[PDB]
Amino acid sequence: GQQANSLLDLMTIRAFHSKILRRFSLGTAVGFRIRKGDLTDIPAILVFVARKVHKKWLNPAQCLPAILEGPGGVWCDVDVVEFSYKEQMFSELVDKLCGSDECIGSGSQVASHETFGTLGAIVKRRTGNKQVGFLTNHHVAVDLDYPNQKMFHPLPPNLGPGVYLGAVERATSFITDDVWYGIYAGTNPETFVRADGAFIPFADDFDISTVTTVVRGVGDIGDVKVIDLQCPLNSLIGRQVCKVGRSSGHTTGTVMAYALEYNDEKGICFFTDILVVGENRQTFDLEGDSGSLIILTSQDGEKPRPIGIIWGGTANRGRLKLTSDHGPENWTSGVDLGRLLDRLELDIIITNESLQDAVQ
Amino acid sequence: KGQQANSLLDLMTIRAFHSKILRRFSLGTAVGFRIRKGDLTDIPAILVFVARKVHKKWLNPAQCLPAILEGPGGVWCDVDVVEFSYEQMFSELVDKLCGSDECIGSGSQVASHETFGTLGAIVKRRTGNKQVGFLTNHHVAVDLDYPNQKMFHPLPPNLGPGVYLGAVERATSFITDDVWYGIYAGTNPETFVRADGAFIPFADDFDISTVTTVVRGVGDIGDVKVIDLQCPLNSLIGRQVCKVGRSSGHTTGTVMAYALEYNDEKGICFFTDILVVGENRQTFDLEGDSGSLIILTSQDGEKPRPIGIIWGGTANRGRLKLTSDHGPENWTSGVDLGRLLDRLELDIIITNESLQD
Amino acid sequence: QANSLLDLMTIRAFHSKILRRFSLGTAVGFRIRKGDLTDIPAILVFVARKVHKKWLNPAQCLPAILEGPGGVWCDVDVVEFSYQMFSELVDKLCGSDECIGSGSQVASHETFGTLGAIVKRRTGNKQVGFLTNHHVAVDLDYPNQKMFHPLPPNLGPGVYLGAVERATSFITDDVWYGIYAGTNPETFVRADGAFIPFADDFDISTVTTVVRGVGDIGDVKVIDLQCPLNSLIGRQVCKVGRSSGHTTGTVMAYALEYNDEKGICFFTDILVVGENRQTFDLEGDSGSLIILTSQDGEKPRPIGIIWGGTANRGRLKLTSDHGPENWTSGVDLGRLLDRLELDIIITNESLQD
Ligand SMILES: Nc1ncnc2c1ncn2[C@@H]1O[C@H](COP(=O)(O)OP(=O)(O)OP(=O)(O)O)[C@@H](O)[C@H]1O
Ligand SMILES: Nc1ncnc2c1ncn2[C@@H]1O[C@H](COP(=O)(O)OP(=O)(O)OP(=O)(O)O)[C@@H](O)[C@H]1O
Ligand SMILES: Nc1ncnc2c1ncn2[C@@H]1O[C@H](COP(=O)(O)OP(=O)(O)OP(=O)(O)O)[C@@H](O)[C@H]1O
């Protein structure tokens, strides 16, 4: 008879009641109840519909209950959100990240022969030789069917001047929920979590001595921050995050929901990790920022800690409307950094001391 | 040496008397107040809508319209040359008129299986059953490619949640000028005015107890104000009007011309009744506002009076230049409420105690 | 065993729930086996694709026998639905003639069409005219159009025929058929029809009653819903159209029921397919008269009017070593006549008087 106070409890409650909510919803996530336009502190399951019609034009069989109970007597609220399923910045930071700098690092532009992207972090393989490289999104890194994919910065040789970074070695795709979350967050045989990743070691002839580990526009970042499923709920949802992109530069935002699910028509259930909406009714990211690091804003004057990377373009998928008298605002979807570094056995490099010593 | 134009009727027949030279090089013609230097004056005139207003140095005398016309009994009036061509709001009212409220009324969103529209008002038929329904335009109501077209609010069941309102009962199509105005306004055997409208009865099992007469943004409206065609010209032209729409919310405007006539290539001459332009170069209605009530803004502190409804959502039909320091601004066309209340015989409900009878 | 149409629609109405699960439509006719029609009454089930009964779930295998009230049984057939001629007749039906008649080209300001038969209202003034399809006759937002032959004055030389007076919209099956053919509150039997009176100043002396290319037709033939099944299904039909000219065909099925994703049930009356793997009407023959081929030295009798515009649309795909064939939909010209209360002037004596 207790109230949910962690992400695991809400995820288990949604798993118990997966069939009721999905009947008239375009998606479902777990977070904080949104009332009168801003987050409250009451845990709730956020269900996503296409329109919020007053419950006077709804038959009784379409009015979702506001309270659900799960295993062991855990209850939580139900909140209904109105979901929906090119302004490039010009500044001194975008120019440097697009290749007008003397060094490469996080937020820099990485390109293939066909698509652009954004450099993520500078990572390290935890096993074997422990080569040095970087990690990004495979939708900009791996072309489905050319046999080899090479990395160039800023542009490929067939499009402009650039240098050859490396080749894709390991790439990730949708994985089962059991390995990712550790629980059965659903009643479907085929539930996959989309977490793109790509480890590209630097070439043996590369000039790696002109790379940096500090984030341009954020300063110095700390060690990676893992997301625990049984921690207080106000530790992930409702916090302040930032991003450095090649197209939009430094942008700020906040975390709105966790564990977004889509349920395509063919029957496969796809989970999306994080939901980020920009601040001051701005956009958190453009299209082309896929790969940029997502870092929590420093609190009580500590070192900011990356918590994930941007999946890609969410404008095509749609936007969301927070209860207000203003127009809808788009969102941004992320991926957990911890279980994307564990699945690839990668280590975050924050300073040059761990870079110089491990380049041997 | 005679009398000057001083009203709408019998000085609009002056255009009928001279409908031979007016439309040779013009896209249309209306009657109202002369516009000079961008402001509306008080001299009655006949506005001539051309697609390009050049200075009188590059015109042969053939296409130079005179500034004075004559009619029956020695009546004269001026001639005006006007340049004339032929994304919803996000606020709280817009949200309340699309299903976020607990009541329905004028300005509410009414939808069919294909189109979108706005609720006109709450009405009663003056004979027979006397059931309380509502009225709108038919470009949203009727379809002749379906036997039944039903109304849902906010959305049809095949597009989203909603409630069933009713079906179309009466919708008079384009109607001739003789019964509408009374005068033979034109020398064309086939002259029609597009008085689109549709009376839609409420469902038998529809909850009446959740509908209202409040305009939701104008306050309380009075009895319908008929456009009497024997009053001075300063009774319709130049007054302030307003509307409530599902897309554009609540806006305001002014009346510039009356009885705008349009002739197509096939030969049929079509009259449009009311010309409205926005204030401060703002728009008066978006696309999807067709069927919204047009209400005169009340002066001297009386109750506002509805005088018409919006014909169609304008984005393609209308652009006119008033001043030579700003770009063209679109206009909105309306239909008289009071002769559309006669061919669709009705009675407007203005209080909440006329809903319980 | 059913031996008529009346008890053939009744079984489908009784079993209109299991059939609609995996079908694009349903009609009543004769069983088709190996590409030819048999003499066994059956119910045609129009699926999107034919597969062998081994890649199908047990609930997706439609039974071959259904029963209805009164202990009457019928077979079930599964069909695979897939929902200008240059001659001297096409020229004479397009404006080169010295007279107007059946099969002539009639045009509105927007669309083209085809004249049907010369008709006469049975009450009131009894003034002559003609009847055709309203998707040519009526422009909806302008009810009473003017009729011109061959072309409107804004498109070419022509003469003014008249203006539409009465037009037929969707009709419910209660008045049309008589039986409640369907357990659906909204079942519509949308028979196109439009009587266009001739103008008072029309010459009328240049109007014929013989069908160009068929000769002299007899009186109209009504379709009785309870008769021997080989009286309508399996017969030979023909037409005279403005676009394709004379063309022969064969009636395939009766009372076709197509569906739309709105919940409202519709009905189509007559199914016709071409002969020798040809097309029955290409485009613009909407309104052409459907006439049974003369049998045993008789006079051909009109039995329907083409709905039209179903060549670049519906294909009657067969699973017997060939490409899809085109089907044409028609409407019974006995009830289109009755509910508009008209006649059929078959000879010159009834036109003059
Ligand atoms: N399937 C549905 N589609 C559209 N609207 C619905 C549906 N189900 C419920 N609603 C409406 O959603 C309303 C509640 O949204 P919500 O759950 O957030 O309440 P809230 O947070 O208290 O209020 P607020 O709207 O102020 O954010 C319900 O009370 C009902 O009016
Ligand atoms: N067919 C035409 N096309 C373009 N311009 C025309 C045409 N006919 C007349 N004009 C010119 O329009 C000008 C007159 O406009 P108007 O009729 O408004 O007078 P006005 O009200 O005194 O001036 P304004 O409104 O511009 O201050 C004259 O130069 C007139 O010749
Ligand atoms: N829903 C369906 N979709 C596709 N195919 C089906 C379906 N149901 C049945 N079938 C196949 O259709 C076959 C029969 O078609 P039909 O009913 O006409 O038999 P038939 O006339 O004896 O043979 P023929 O195919 O020679 O015309 C079934 O026996 C089965 O093989």
From Swiss-Prot, chain A:
GO terms for cellular component: cytoplasm; nucleoplasm. It is found in: Nucleus, Nucleoplasm; Cytoplasm. Coiled coil: none annotated. Keywords: Cytoplasm, Developmental protein, Nucleus. Disruption phenotype: Narrow leaf phenotype. Reduced leaf blade width and plant height. Altered internode elongation pattern. Altered vascular patterns in leaves and culms. Its main location: nucleus. Expressed in leaf sheaths, leaf blades, culms and panicles. Preferentially expressed in vascular tissues in leaves and culms. Utilization of photosynthesis-related QTLs can enhance high-yield breeding and provide a new strategy for achieving increased rice productivity. GO terms for biological process: internode patterning; leaf vascular tissue pattern formation; regulation of leaf development; stem vascular tissue pattern formation. Involved in the regulation of lateral leaf growth. May be involved in the regulation of basipetal polar auxin transport (PAT) and vascular patterning in leaves. Controls photosynthesis rate by regulating carboxylation efficiency and consequently photosynthesis rate. Controls panicle and spikelet numbers, and grain yield. This is Protein NARROW LEAF 1. The chain holds residues 88 to 455 of 582 of the full protein.
